[PDB]
Structure formats: C-alpha cells, structure tokens
Amino acid sequence: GALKVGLLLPYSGTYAPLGEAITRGLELYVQSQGGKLGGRSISFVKVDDESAPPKATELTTKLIQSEKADVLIGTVHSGVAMAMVKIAREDGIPTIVPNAGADIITRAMCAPNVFRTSFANGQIGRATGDAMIKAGLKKAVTVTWKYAAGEEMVSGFKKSFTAGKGEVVKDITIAFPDVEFQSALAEIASLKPDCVYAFFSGGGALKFIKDYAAANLGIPLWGPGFLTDGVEAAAGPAGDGIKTVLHYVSDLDNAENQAFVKSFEAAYKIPPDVFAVQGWDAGQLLDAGVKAVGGDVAKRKELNAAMAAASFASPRGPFKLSAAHNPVQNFYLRELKGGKSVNLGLAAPAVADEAIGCKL
C-alpha cells in the first residue's frame, strides 16, 4: 500500500502560508521522483495544527495512533512542535521537523528518530546578532511575538550582540499573533536605537514591514530571514533595504537551486522561499531513509539511522546533519532589494549547533 506520511502543519491561521509552502516543497519533491519515495507510493495525511499548542498532543496522537502514520512531518510553530516531538521521541516513528526552530528539539529532546531540516532558533539569532556587530551596530531594540520562537531568537541575538559589546536597550513583545504594531514603533522611536531586530513571519511580517516603513524612523531594520521570506513582492518599496540573515537566498547559483526554483515557479507561479526549501529537503531526507531500507518502513531503526547519516544537495547547498540531527549549513547575509532578497555574502559558515543537553 501507500506509505502514510502524516503532515502536521498550519493549514489555517497566521502561519497558513508557511504550511502551504512546506507542503508544496514536499509534494514537488515527491513529483520530481515520479510520485514515489524509495519506490513507495506516498499518501499525505494532512492535519491542521492551527498553530495551537493546546491541541498539539491530541493531534499528534491522532496521527501516530488513529491514522497509523508511517512517518511524521511537522510543524511550523515551536510551541506545537515541542509537544509533538515529546510524543514522537517516545514512540519511535521517523519524525522530521520542517520548520519549528525550538532549541530543545535538537538539545534535551534529541532522539534517534527526530530530525530537523530547518534551523535552530538560538543559532540563527546568534548569527544575525553577530552580523549586526560586524556591521558596526551598537544599540538595538528587539521586537517579536511573545512565544517560544520569538523568545529564543531574541535570546540568541542578545547573546552575540552583547558579546560583541553591543547594548540591547529594550525587548518589546507583542501577543501572538497580534499585528497592532504602532505603539511598539512609537516606543522604538523614543528609545533612539541604531537598529531594530525583529522576528515576525507570514502576513504579520508583511504588516510589520509596511507599518515600520510608514513610521519614517530613520533606523535600519534587521531580523532573521523569516521577517522577509514570502512577503517581498507585496511589501513593495517598504521592504527595500531590510537586512536579514538566513540559511537560504533564492539567488544561490548551485544546480539544485536552479532546478528547484524553475520547477517550483512552473508549478506554483511564485518563487519558493525558505519554507518550501525546508519541505523539499524533508522529502530528500525521507527518500534517503526509505531507499536505505528498500521501501520497508517496518525497519524504523535502520531507516532513522540512514537519515542521520544522509547528505545530499539542497537548494541551500550541501545538506548534512550534526550528531543531534540539526542541519549544519551556511547562513547568508541578505538585503531585500527589488522585491527579492539578494545575497550579500556569507554571515556564518556551516557549524554545528552546540547541542547542550543532547545525550546520545
């Protein structure tokens, strides 16, 4: 029969476009392989997590127990993902996290069956802060949503910004997923920083970019690249000049990216963003696992071990995992210019997240 791949993703709410992009990346990859992974037909069982941590346990249990998924792929929101991984790590089902950056997933919750194709929150925050110090910035205000991902990406940023002798004069938070930003912008003006570090993503990021530009602050905006990915065209001139750090830029010139961008644009009529890349690579990682067991997914231990050792070309570059199963990959400095992010050069080379707490 078909291999049942459970997809726990946001198909509604604020992160619906990210769930859509990840699903597109994964489906496009399966199509690129003639509709199979490791010889097996694929059936996607798509469960909407609503980016709602209170539902995460029950939805994960539905996928593992009631739907009898063979593989679990999810999710976007770090709070949902940490609850999902808490169950999945005890069950043993092969599990791939295609976005959620929660630090714990490849730290204390690391497990032989849990893999990530995206990033860790603290690591990307650190890379962004270090790029800002290298740029000569000294006095930051941070603004983000009040949940794990925002807290962790701000924490990483603050560590590298303050190690570089910068000062963070205020951390402003907004309830998730509220998009009333004007009072935060007035506070930012009053604090007179030399930069702002922001984490938002999806339509909330678009609104933030628009509102920030309309405030006429004369202060440069920075963030992890989630702040701009997927919203570049709609942001228009308000986006121009925003600086970000991310593990993907659409202009990367390698063969895998060129073919992927062409295939994705032909299918969906927009460029792929980082979320689509992360879904595509979840497909490549699963393919590696299923091929190594000749399609026999009953061989879970062997399938998971093969994924741990996998390496393949990603649209990013060479893909490989650390011992804790997080990607080891470049982070690029980018600027939004002309309705797309362009590569300004390498911000961080490919180094393994410290993985403190990951035992075995």
Short mmCIF file of C-alpha atoms in Angstrom, two decimals:
data_model
loop_
_atom_site.label_atom_id
_atom_site.label_comp_id
_atom_site.label_asym_id
_atom_site.label_seq_id
_atom_site.Cartn_x
_atom_site.Cartn_y
_atom_site.Cartn_z
CA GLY A 1 0.00 0.00 0.00
CA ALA A 2 0.96 3.69 0.07
CA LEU A 3 3.44 4.91 2.70
CA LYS A 4 1.37 7.11 5.03
CA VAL A 5 3.14 10.35 5.75
CA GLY A 6 1.44 12.36 8.46
CA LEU A 7 1.78 16.11 7.97
CA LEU A 8 1.08 18.21 11.00
CA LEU A 9 1.22 21.78 9.76
CA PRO A 10 -0.66 25.06 9.95
CA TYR A 11 -3.25 24.92 7.15
CA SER A 12 -5.19 27.75 8.79
CA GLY A 13 -4.39 30.86 10.75
CA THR A 14 -1.45 33.13 10.82
CA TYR A 15 1.09 30.60 9.55
CA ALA A 16 -1.08 29.07 6.82
CA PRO A 17 1.26 30.39 4.05
CA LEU A 18 4.21 28.66 5.71
CA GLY A 19 2.26 25.36 5.97
CA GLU A 20 1.33 25.77 2.32
CA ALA A 21 4.95 26.43 1.25
CA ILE A 22 6.31 23.42 3.17
CA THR A 23 3.63 21.16 1.76
CA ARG A 24 4.38 22.43 -1.76
CA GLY A 25 8.07 21.77 -1.37
CA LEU A 26 7.46 18.23 -0.16
CA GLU A 27 4.86 17.44 -2.84
CA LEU A 28 7.04 18.89 -5.58
CA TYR A 29 9.91 16.69 -4.47
CA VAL A 30 7.72 13.60 -4.50
CA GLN A 31 6.56 14.56 -8.01
CA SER A 32 10.15 15.04 -9.11
CA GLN A 33 10.72 11.38 -8.15
CA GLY A 34 7.75 10.17 -10.21
CA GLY A 35 5.37 10.15 -7.28
CA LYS A 36 7.37 7.80 -5.02
CA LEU A 37 9.97 7.81 -2.27
CA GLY A 38 12.26 4.79 -2.21
CA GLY A 39 9.87 3.01 -4.59
CA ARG A 40 6.88 3.61 -2.36
CA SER A 41 3.77 5.50 -3.30
CA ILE A 42 3.04 8.27 -0.86
CA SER A 43 -0.19 9.26 0.81
CA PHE A 44 -0.12 12.53 2.79
CA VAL A 45 -2.43 12.73 5.75
CA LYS A 46 -2.70 16.45 6.38
CA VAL A 47 -3.70 17.57 9.89
CA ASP A 48 -4.16 21.25 10.62
CA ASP A 49 -2.40 22.17 13.85
CA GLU A 50 -3.85 25.73 13.82
CA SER A 51 -0.55 26.84 15.37
CA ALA A 52 -2.29 26.00 18.68
CA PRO A 53 -0.13 24.34 21.31
CA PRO A 54 -3.17 23.24 23.38
CA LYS A 55 -4.18 20.90 20.53
CA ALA A 56 -0.74 19.55 19.76
CA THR A 57 -0.86 16.43 21.95
CA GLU A 58 -4.24 15.28 20.70
CA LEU A 59 -3.41 15.94 17.02
CA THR A 60 -0.06 14.18 17.25
CA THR A 61 -1.73 11.21 18.93
CA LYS A 62 -4.39 11.12 16.14
CA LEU A 63 -1.64 10.96 13.52
CA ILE A 64 0.50 8.32 15.23
CA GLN A 65 -2.26 6.13 16.69
CA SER A 66 -5.56 6.63 14.82
CA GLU A 67 -4.17 7.34 11.34
CA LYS A 68 -1.27 4.90 11.88
CA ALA A 69 1.19 7.15 10.09
CA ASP A 70 4.43 5.56 8.97
CA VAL A 71 6.33 8.86 9.17
CA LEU A 72 5.56 12.16 10.88
CA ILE A 73 6.48 15.54 9.38
CA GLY A 74 5.72 18.74 11.30
CA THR A 75 5.47 21.54 12.22
CA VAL A 76 5.89 25.36 11.95
CA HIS A 77 5.17 26.81 15.40
CA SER A 78 7.76 25.95 18.04
CA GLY A 79 5.25 25.50 20.83
CA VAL A 80 3.25 22.94 18.83
CA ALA A 81 6.44 21.25 17.67
CA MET A 82 7.89 20.74 21.11
CA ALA A 83 4.69 18.99 22.24
CA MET A 84 4.71 16.89 19.06
CA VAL A 85 8.33 15.84 19.47
CA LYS A 86 7.77 14.98 23.14
CA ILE A 87 5.38 12.22 22.00
CA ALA A 88 7.17 11.24 18.84
CA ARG A 89 10.51 10.72 20.60
CA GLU A 90 8.90 8.12 22.90
CA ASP A 91 7.04 6.39 20.09
CA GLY A 92 9.98 5.94 17.69
CA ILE A 93 8.14 6.86 14.49
CA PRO A 94 10.52 8.57 11.97
CA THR A 95 9.93 12.28 12.55
CA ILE A 96 11.13 15.25 10.52
CA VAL A 97 10.66 18.85 11.70
CA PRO A 98 10.48 21.03 8.57
CA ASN A 99 10.47 24.45 10.24
CA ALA A 100 9.97 24.88 14.02
CA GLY A 101 13.22 26.17 15.45
CA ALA A 102 12.63 25.22 19.06
CA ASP A 103 16.06 24.85 20.63
CA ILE A 104 15.04 21.85 22.70
CA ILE A 105 14.24 19.64 19.70
CA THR A 106 17.93 19.05 18.97
CA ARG A 107 19.06 19.58 22.55
CA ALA A 108 17.36 17.83 25.53
CA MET A 109 14.60 16.34 23.33
CA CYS A 110 17.03 14.98 20.73
CA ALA A 111 16.35 11.37 19.78
CA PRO A 112 17.39 8.74 17.25
CA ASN A 113 14.11 9.19 15.34
CA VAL A 114 13.87 13.01 15.36
CA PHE A 115 15.40 15.08 12.58
CA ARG A 116 15.21 18.73 11.56
CA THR A 117 15.58 20.14 8.06
CA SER A 118 15.28 23.81 9.05
CA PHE A 119 17.39 25.54 11.76
CA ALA A 120 17.58 26.18 15.48
CA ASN A 121 16.21 29.45 16.86
CA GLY A 122 19.15 30.38 19.02
CA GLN A 123 21.67 29.64 16.31
CA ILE A 124 20.04 31.83 13.70
CA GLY A 125 19.50 34.58 16.27
CA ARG A 126 23.20 34.42 17.18
CA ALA A 127 24.20 34.61 13.52
CA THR A 128 22.04 37.68 12.98
CA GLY A 129 23.42 39.44 16.05
CA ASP A 130 26.98 38.70 15.01
CA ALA A 131 26.33 40.13 11.53
CA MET A 132 24.94 43.29 13.13
CA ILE A 133 28.07 43.71 15.28
CA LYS A 134 30.21 43.16 12.18
CA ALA A 135 28.17 45.93 10.50
CA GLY A 136 29.12 48.35 13.31
CA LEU A 137 25.78 48.50 15.11
CA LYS A 138 25.80 49.12 18.84
CA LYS A 139 22.37 49.94 20.28
CA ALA A 140 19.45 47.65 19.49
CA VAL A 141 15.80 47.32 20.30
CA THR A 142 14.19 43.90 19.70
CA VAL A 143 10.55 43.32 18.80
CA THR A 144 8.80 39.98 18.34
CA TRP A 145 5.86 37.84 19.33
CA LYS A 146 5.57 36.54 22.89
CA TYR A 147 6.07 32.82 22.36
CA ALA A 148 9.00 30.38 22.32
CA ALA A 149 10.35 31.10 18.90
CA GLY A 150 10.45 34.84 19.36
CA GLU A 151 11.92 34.47 22.85
CA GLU A 152 14.63 32.10 21.65
CA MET A 153 15.61 34.01 18.55
CA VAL A 154 15.85 37.22 20.61
CA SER A 155 17.88 35.35 23.25
CA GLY A 156 20.41 34.17 20.66
CA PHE A 157 20.65 37.60 19.12
CA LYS A 158 21.20 39.22 22.53
CA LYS A 159 23.99 36.79 23.36
CA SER A 160 26.02 37.55 20.27
CA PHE A 161 25.19 41.24 20.22
CA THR A 162 26.20 41.77 23.82
CA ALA A 163 29.32 39.51 23.49
CA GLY A 164 30.33 41.88 20.70
CA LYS A 165 29.83 44.78 23.21
CA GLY A 166 26.59 46.00 21.73
CA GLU A 167 23.77 47.02 24.02
CA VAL A 168 20.15 45.87 23.76
CA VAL A 169 18.20 48.71 25.30
CA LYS A 170 14.76 47.12 25.22
CA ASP A 171 12.99 43.91 24.26
CA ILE A 172 9.43 44.63 23.17
CA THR A 173 6.91 41.84 22.77
CA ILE A 174 3.56 41.61 21.10
CA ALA A 175 0.97 38.90 21.96
CA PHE A 176 0.95 36.13 19.28
CA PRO A 177 -0.38 36.61 16.57
CA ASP A 178 -1.41 40.25 17.12
CA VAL A 179 -0.43 42.73 14.42
CA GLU A 180 -1.00 46.05 16.17
CA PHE A 181 2.46 47.46 15.93
CA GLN A 182 2.16 51.24 16.09
CA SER A 183 2.72 51.59 19.81
CA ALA A 184 5.85 49.44 19.58
CA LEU A 185 7.08 51.66 16.75
CA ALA A 186 6.47 54.79 18.86
CA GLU A 187 8.43 53.20 21.69
CA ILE A 188 11.26 52.32 19.32
CA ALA A 189 11.42 55.94 18.13
CA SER A 190 11.58 57.19 21.72
CA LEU A 191 14.46 54.85 22.56
CA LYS A 192 16.61 56.10 19.65
CA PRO A 193 18.39 52.82 18.87
CA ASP A 194 20.74 52.48 15.91
CA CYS A 195 18.92 49.36 14.74
CA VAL A 196 15.88 47.16 15.30
CA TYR A 197 15.94 43.37 15.37
CA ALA A 198 12.53 41.84 14.60
CA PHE A 199 11.14 38.37 14.30
CA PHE A 200 7.75 38.04 12.62
CA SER A 201 6.76 35.74 9.76
CA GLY A 202 3.81 35.41 7.37
CA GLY A 203 1.21 38.09 6.87
CA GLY A 204 2.18 39.57 10.24
CA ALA A 205 5.69 40.18 8.89
CA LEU A 206 4.25 41.91 5.82
CA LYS A 207 2.21 44.20 8.03
CA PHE A 208 5.17 44.89 10.28
CA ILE A 209 7.34 45.85 7.31
CA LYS A 210 4.63 48.18 5.95
CA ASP A 211 3.98 49.77 9.33
CA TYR A 212 7.70 50.13 10.14
CA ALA A 213 8.39 51.95 6.84
CA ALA A 214 5.37 54.21 7.36
CA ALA A 215 6.74 55.30 10.71
CA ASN A 216 9.68 57.01 8.98
CA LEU A 217 12.04 56.01 11.77
CA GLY A 218 15.39 56.51 10.04
CA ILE A 219 16.57 53.35 11.82
CA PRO A 220 17.68 50.19 9.94
CA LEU A 221 15.58 47.06 10.30
CA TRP A 222 17.16 43.67 10.67
CA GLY A 223 15.96 40.19 11.50
CA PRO A 224 16.27 36.53 10.82
CA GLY A 225 15.17 35.97 7.24
CA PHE A 226 11.72 34.77 8.18
CA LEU A 227 10.94 38.51 8.52
CA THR A 228 11.03 38.90 4.71
CA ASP A 229 10.66 35.46 3.17
CA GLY A 230 7.41 35.09 1.25
CA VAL A 231 6.32 38.73 1.63
CA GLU A 232 8.88 40.51 -0.58
CA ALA A 233 6.67 41.32 -3.56
CA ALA A 234 3.71 42.51 -1.52
CA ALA A 235 5.88 44.70 0.70
CA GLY A 236 6.90 46.81 -2.27
CA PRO A 237 9.21 49.73 -1.57
CA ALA A 238 8.59 49.46 2.15
CA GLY A 239 10.78 46.33 2.13
CA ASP A 240 13.77 47.81 0.34
CA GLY A 241 16.91 47.88 2.43
CA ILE A 242 15.87 45.46 5.16
CA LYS A 243 18.82 43.29 6.15
CA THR A 244 18.39 39.66 7.19
CA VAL A 245 20.38 36.53 7.90
CA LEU A 246 19.11 33.18 6.63
CA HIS A 247 20.23 29.74 5.51
CA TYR A 248 18.66 30.28 2.07
CA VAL A 249 18.68 33.01 -0.58
CA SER A 250 16.78 32.49 -3.81
CA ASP A 251 19.71 33.58 -5.95
CA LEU A 252 22.04 30.81 -4.79
CA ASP A 253 23.69 29.63 -8.01
CA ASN A 254 24.07 25.89 -7.39
CA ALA A 255 22.43 23.32 -9.73
CA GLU A 256 19.92 22.03 -7.20
CA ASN A 257 18.56 25.51 -6.53
CA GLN A 258 18.40 26.42 -10.17
CA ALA A 259 16.36 23.33 -10.98
CA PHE A 260 14.16 23.65 -7.91
CA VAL A 261 13.34 27.31 -8.49
CA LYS A 262 12.47 26.51 -12.13
CA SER A 263 10.24 23.56 -11.15
CA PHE A 264 8.57 25.40 -8.29
CA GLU A 265 7.81 28.51 -10.37
CA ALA A 266 6.40 26.35 -13.17
CA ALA A 267 4.07 24.58 -10.72
CA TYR A 268 3.08 27.43 -8.42
CA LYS A 269 3.89 30.73 -10.28
CA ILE A 270 5.79 32.27 -7.38
CA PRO A 271 9.36 31.73 -6.24
CA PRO A 272 9.98 29.21 -3.49
CA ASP A 273 11.00 30.62 -0.13
CA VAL A 274 12.91 29.04 2.74
CA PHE A 275 9.83 27.16 3.94
CA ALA A 276 9.44 25.49 0.56
CA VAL A 277 13.13 24.57 0.61
CA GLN A 278 12.76 23.04 4.05
CA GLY A 279 9.82 20.92 2.83
CA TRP A 280 11.67 19.83 -0.27
CA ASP A 281 14.60 18.75 1.84
CA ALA A 282 12.35 16.87 4.24
CA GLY A 283 11.39 14.95 1.07
CA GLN A 284 15.03 14.33 0.20
CA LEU A 285 15.86 13.20 3.73
CA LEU A 286 12.89 10.83 3.83
CA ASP A 287 13.83 9.49 0.41
CA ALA A 288 17.31 8.69 1.72
CA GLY A 289 15.81 6.80 4.68
CA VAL A 290 13.25 4.83 2.65
CA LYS A 291 15.78 3.93 -0.07
CA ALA A 292 18.24 2.62 2.56
CA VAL A 293 15.61 0.10 3.74
CA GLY A 294 14.45 -0.85 0.26
CA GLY A 295 10.96 0.54 0.92
CA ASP A 296 10.41 -1.49 4.08
CA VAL A 297 9.44 1.13 6.63
CA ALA A 298 8.89 -1.51 9.29
CA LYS A 299 12.68 -1.26 9.59
CA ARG A 300 12.39 2.01 11.59
CA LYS A 301 15.77 1.81 13.32
CA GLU A 302 17.58 1.33 10.06
CA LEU A 303 15.52 3.97 8.28
CA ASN A 304 16.30 6.53 11.03
CA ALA A 305 20.00 5.63 11.08
CA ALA A 306 20.15 6.21 7.33
CA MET A 307 18.58 9.64 7.69
CA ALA A 308 21.09 10.55 10.38
CA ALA A 309 23.95 9.78 8.01
CA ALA A 310 22.34 11.35 4.98
CA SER A 311 23.87 14.01 2.83
CA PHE A 312 22.57 15.35 -0.43
CA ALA A 313 22.49 18.54 -2.39
CA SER A 314 19.89 21.01 -1.17
CA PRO A 315 18.78 24.20 -2.88
CA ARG A 316 20.85 25.75 0.01
CA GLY A 317 23.99 23.92 -0.67
CA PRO A 318 25.30 20.57 0.65
CA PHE A 319 22.94 19.33 3.30
CA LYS A 320 24.23 17.47 6.35
CA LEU A 321 23.18 16.87 9.92
CA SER A 322 25.03 17.28 13.20
CA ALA A 323 25.16 14.42 15.70
CA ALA A 324 21.99 15.90 17.29
CA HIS A 325 20.24 15.87 13.89
CA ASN A 326 20.14 19.60 13.20
CA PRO A 327 21.34 20.97 9.84
CA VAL A 328 24.94 22.15 9.52
CA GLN A 329 24.74 24.89 6.96
CA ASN A 330 25.83 28.36 5.92
CA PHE A 331 23.96 31.45 7.00
CA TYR A 332 23.96 34.25 4.44
CA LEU A 333 23.68 37.99 4.93
CA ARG A 334 20.92 39.31 2.70
CA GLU A 335 19.21 42.55 1.76
CA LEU A 336 15.73 42.95 0.40
CA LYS A 337 16.11 44.85 -2.87
CA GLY A 338 13.77 44.97 -5.80
CA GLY A 339 11.22 42.56 -4.42
CA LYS A 340 13.59 39.74 -3.51
CA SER A 341 16.40 39.09 -1.03
CA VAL A 342 19.87 39.20 -2.54
CA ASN A 343 22.98 37.57 -1.17
CA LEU A 344 25.48 39.98 0.37
CA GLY A 345 27.83 37.18 1.38
CA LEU A 346 28.37 34.56 3.99
CA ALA A 347 27.46 35.61 7.54
CA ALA A 348 28.34 32.31 9.27
CA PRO A 349 29.97 29.22 7.76
CA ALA A 350 28.46 25.82 8.32
CA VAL A 351 28.89 24.98 12.01
CA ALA A 352 27.09 22.59 14.33
CA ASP A 353 24.69 23.96 16.97
CA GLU A 354 26.19 23.39 20.35
CA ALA A 355 23.52 20.83 21.27
CA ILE A 356 24.00 21.07 25.02
CA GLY A 357 21.64 18.55 26.63
CA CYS A 358 21.62 16.15 23.70
CA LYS A 359 22.57 12.84 25.18
CA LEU A 360 23.45 10.21 22.61
#
